[PDB]
RNA sequence: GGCGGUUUUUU
């Protein structure tokens, strides 16, 4: 019974990319085959394109409730 | 699918400037030769100055700047000397540099005019333009002031610094009569006629020529005093040829490695 | 001044300008004037700069208003009425109204 | 060599085609393997490889020069006109796709390729796992008319 | 790494149409 | 040359442990309230906090 | 064949509204057989033209006789036959508009093809019978040669 | 005088902008698609009285606005009686259909009634007759791109049945949603929010217009619908945007 | 303070190659030659010589940046003629032409000097 | 390891 928009806002996308890049920089298991790159930000972008980032966004609503979305669940904008 | 056969004709040969005309060549080659005259032309000039005592009124770097601007003849020494950077020794060896010394001191009451004549060069031929017309004024000293220094002049080209710029003012002109229309005159009658204009005084500019290529490039190379004008032309042609030869050698090595 | 109708370039100038195009497909366009000599046009060279298949119409600054009503609507004598189709400049001159 | 702790076992899928498997290619097992690493093979890798090699027991299997898709395609599009009443089927192994086997046949008058996967319990075809190796081949001959 | 998943891949099945008649070979026994 | 300036954790004041001010004192540029409003409009709260805390005056 | 159009024209007026540019001018020409108007813009500089001059204008879709429909690219290194060998002024443009006097019942009887040669515009107005080979969004050539008569 | 004016302007506008920003530095769009301040007080049920970002909006004209009744009637009615014109536009396999089937005739009559209703709404909404209005998707440019891509060639009879255009527009209006929810109040708010846009969309994509001026084909129209819905969804405002600071 | 020296406009740095070749993938028989530590002098002439060669479909040099001492010459010849040999022949014929011009100039000068 | 004020300049 989720009513929030099914698209990924730019703010959420940017924050998720930065967070995944940081987790990767701290030596973490990737969720996609690396074609031959070492930039953690690029790896996070590739992971986003592949839809394999193990992160779910907890969007809060004005009342107080919150809806948990998944990078592989909601549609990506860019 | 090959190059062309350019011809040359000199119109004025003097010890200060040379006017010539190159025919059956390309505008790019003409401009390249001009830029090579202005920059890539080996020539000697003061470069490493050492001042032991300067009580003059100017600065300590002002003297070095003026000494670097002073020309030095190098008719048959620049082709022999090598670049100090490519030298295979330490300290300015006479094989790749010329030495100069200056030691002046104003004793009399009248002010002194330290000119370029005070630059006593160790070599006979490498000397400032004072052979054959006043000398280059370095500084003026008053009673009680002095100036003692020793300088070394090396080989270089204009691309590095303006001191090694032999050509004073290269005048290059192609197509006097705006025939190729490379320059559109809003009012042709208001512009004068070029020095090399063969058009009569009635018509303002020659008519249009569609199947017309830029040819007949007029050069007027004016030498500063170091190298003769014809010597500058020959040195520039040799330098351009050497650059092309080095590029070809590098290309052959690169093709062979791949 | 480059996008005017009386702008003609030689193969040398065209190939030199094409060097400064980071999105060039690598193919030289057919010259607007094959004979008596290959002459490109300023507008023809600028067409390659427009990416994709963009379509737009714009009016030039010195565009007489009493032109669309009378004849020569789709063929302006003064070379106005910028009409870009499939990302290719056809008519008109570029100015602040278009760029 | 990819990471640490885990271990990789390389085995023979068939005649020429090999396959690597990393244990947690992902192969799950129990924790007692640390005491007798012989079990990862004596209970999973070796039985799976034997199931994969069982195709060698049937003469209908071939090599096709390491499983050349082009060769099978040309053969299938030529035999359709050379012997319409005797269209053969083939089962081969691909060198560019370990763990899979190409089952080449003609569903219709158009070219098409199909693959079958091997699993610890047996094989996998059309999304259904089979406990035996012959059961899948006997079920294909009946359910290939879809 | 250079040795990724193989069996975990989902075998995609292709679709098609062919209003054909029944004239193929029968079936064999399982024995 | 008289106007070029940079910084990478230079000296800090004594009253409010924040970067100095002035090119001579080797100080950092001021992130004005207008810059705060610009960042708010962009929506880069992480960058905003990094500028107004991380690279300003961290303290516990 | 590919000859979308071919006809002789004669010049009758140049830049009626005053010459705007310095190298291009309008050529208000009229046919001799088909009775058609032509508002061409040519390069007066390289190919000068005066009043009363006649030229054989041939709008084609390709320069080859056999008609292979070239892809469209500058390829001077081509030894194939070319229709441009017997023409003095050639240009490559793309017809961008085809207006007509259509109605809501009976078809159109008079068309007008507006083509742009990379900047230079040409309007060829006439009947809706000889302009069948003109279609919007399509490359064409000019091919015009002056007749000595 | 000019220098003094510039100085005083720079001195006053600074304080003005400072106050404007401190008044609304906290306003922002929430995930509930509603603008609120720091106290969660609703300022706008939908951002900009629409719920769309101010970046993907361009100027357009309302075709059905300020027309002459007779002009509007003859331009947005699609006469299914002139068999000659019907053959000229559509194809023979459609002229007979539009002539025989009366369900299609009733559907077009209902469409024209809806078009008249939307025109009256615009007239009572936009007094003074101002056609220039800001809307998200530029339908004219989209139709032009579709033509140039699919090579429509406006001259030959197109293959697009008016029932197809009507059902496509209806399905597209049902898809574009802002106030999600089957509740009566939710549906009423959704209709009121996307009213002007749907009115403009219908006025542009009309049976007579699509069959006379555009001549789009079936695939071209399908691509047009897809592009319109994608662009509208992209222009939807992104929750978590400081609309307050932007307006300041 | 950050003014570059004056020798970095012609002198090569340890590791930098004078000329580099890169084949393009957009069109056949196309090669870009990157020359380091050169200017328009050693580029405009080569472009003009390549243009004269009829088998060269395209030939043009550019400078990625004025402060950067580097140029890129894109060449494209017929499929039966490679850009490497095109460049080689261009440079060779240009060198021969410059030598002939120098000899002619020298003889003209020696004739003008009392002759 | 150093402060407050004023003035002058620059976008
Ligand atoms: Zn030495």
Short mmCIF file of C-alpha atoms in Angstrom, two decimals, chain G residues 34-130:
data_model
loop_
_atom_site.label_atom_id
_atom_site.label_comp_id
_atom_site.label_asym_id
_atom_site.label_seq_id
_atom_site.Cartn_x
_atom_site.Cartn_y
_atom_site.Cartn_z
CA UNK G 34 6.03 23.57 -69.15
CA UNK G 35 5.44 27.21 -68.25
CA UNK G 36 6.97 27.24 -64.79
CA UNK G 37 8.44 29.85 -62.50
CA UNK G 38 11.90 29.49 -60.98
CA UNK G 39 13.19 31.54 -58.05
CA UNK G 40 16.75 30.23 -57.83
CA UNK G 41 19.62 31.59 -55.71
CA UNK G 42 23.01 31.04 -57.35
CA UNK G 43 26.59 32.10 -56.64
CA UNK G 44 26.83 35.09 -58.94
CA UNK G 45 30.55 35.36 -58.18
CA UNK G 46 31.88 32.07 -59.57
CA UNK G 47 28.97 31.58 -62.04
CA UNK G 48 27.85 35.03 -63.24
CA UNK G 49 24.53 35.39 -65.04
CA UNK G 50 22.72 38.31 -66.71
CA UNK G 51 19.20 38.90 -67.99
CA UNK G 52 17.92 37.02 -71.01
CA UNK G 53 20.29 34.14 -70.41
CA UNK G 54 18.99 30.61 -70.90
CA UNK G 55 20.17 27.54 -69.00
CA UNK G 56 19.24 23.86 -69.05
CA UNK G 57 18.31 23.02 -65.47
CA UNK G 58 18.13 19.35 -64.46
CA UNK G 59 17.01 18.45 -60.95
CA UNK G 60 18.09 14.87 -60.42
CA UNK G 61 18.24 12.43 -57.54
CA UNK G 62 21.69 11.15 -58.48
CA UNK G 63 24.53 11.99 -60.84
CA UNK G 64 24.97 8.47 -62.20
CA UNK G 65 23.34 7.36 -65.43
CA UNK G 66 22.53 3.84 -64.27
CA UNK G 67 20.96 5.31 -61.15
CA UNK G 68 22.32 3.47 -58.12
CA UNK G 69 21.01 5.93 -55.51
CA UNK G 70 24.20 7.08 -53.79
CA UNK G 71 24.21 7.18 -50.01
CA UNK G 72 25.30 10.82 -50.07
CA UNK G 73 28.89 11.64 -49.16
CA UNK G 74 31.81 13.57 -50.62
CA UNK G 75 33.82 11.08 -52.68
CA UNK G 76 35.81 12.85 -55.39
CA UNK G 77 37.86 9.69 -56.10
CA UNK G 78 35.17 8.17 -58.30
CA UNK G 79 35.72 7.13 -61.91
CA UNK G 80 32.10 6.20 -62.52
CA UNK G 81 30.22 8.13 -65.21
CA UNK G 82 28.58 11.34 -64.01
CA UNK G 83 25.83 13.48 -65.49
CA UNK G 84 27.72 16.52 -64.17
CA UNK G 85 30.25 16.18 -67.01
CA UNK G 86 27.98 18.24 -69.30
CA UNK G 87 26.82 20.87 -66.81
CA UNK G 88 28.59 24.05 -65.70
CA UNK G 89 26.96 24.74 -62.28
CA UNK G 90 26.01 21.88 -59.95
CA UNK G 91 24.66 22.05 -56.38
CA UNK G 92 23.43 19.45 -53.87
CA UNK G 93 20.38 20.36 -51.78
CA UNK G 94 17.34 18.77 -50.13
CA UNK G 95 13.78 19.71 -51.04
CA UNK G 96 12.26 21.00 -47.80
CA UNK G 97 8.72 21.99 -48.79
CA UNK G 98 6.13 21.19 -51.46
CA UNK G 99 3.15 23.51 -51.29
CA UNK G 100 0.00 22.96 -53.33
CA UNK G 101 -3.49 24.31 -53.96
CA UNK G 102 -5.27 21.28 -52.48
CA UNK G 103 -8.86 21.37 -51.20
CA UNK G 104 -11.13 19.18 -49.09
CA UNK G 105 -12.55 17.30 -52.09
CA UNK G 106 -10.60 17.60 -55.35
CA UNK G 107 -6.85 17.00 -55.55
CA UNK G 108 -4.26 19.72 -56.05
CA UNK G 109 -3.58 21.14 -59.52
CA UNK G 110 -0.55 23.37 -58.88
CA UNK G 111 2.50 22.64 -56.73
CA UNK G 112 5.62 24.56 -55.75
CA UNK G 113 8.79 22.80 -54.63
CA UNK G 114 11.05 24.72 -52.25
CA UNK G 115 14.54 23.22 -52.08
CA UNK G 116 17.58 24.45 -50.15
CA UNK G 117 21.11 23.89 -51.46
CA UNK G 118 22.80 24.15 -48.08
CA UNK G 119 21.79 27.79 -47.83
CA UNK G 120 20.80 28.74 -51.34
CA UNK G 121 17.05 28.44 -51.91
CA UNK G 122 15.17 27.53 -55.09
CA UNK G 123 11.40 27.54 -55.59
CA UNK G 124 10.10 25.70 -58.68
CA UNK G 125 6.41 26.60 -59.12
CA UNK G 126 4.30 25.04 -61.86
CA UNK G 127 1.63 22.43 -62.51
CA UNK G 128 1.07 19.39 -60.29
CA UNK G 129 1.85 16.99 -63.16
CA UNK G 130 5.58 17.39 -63.78
#
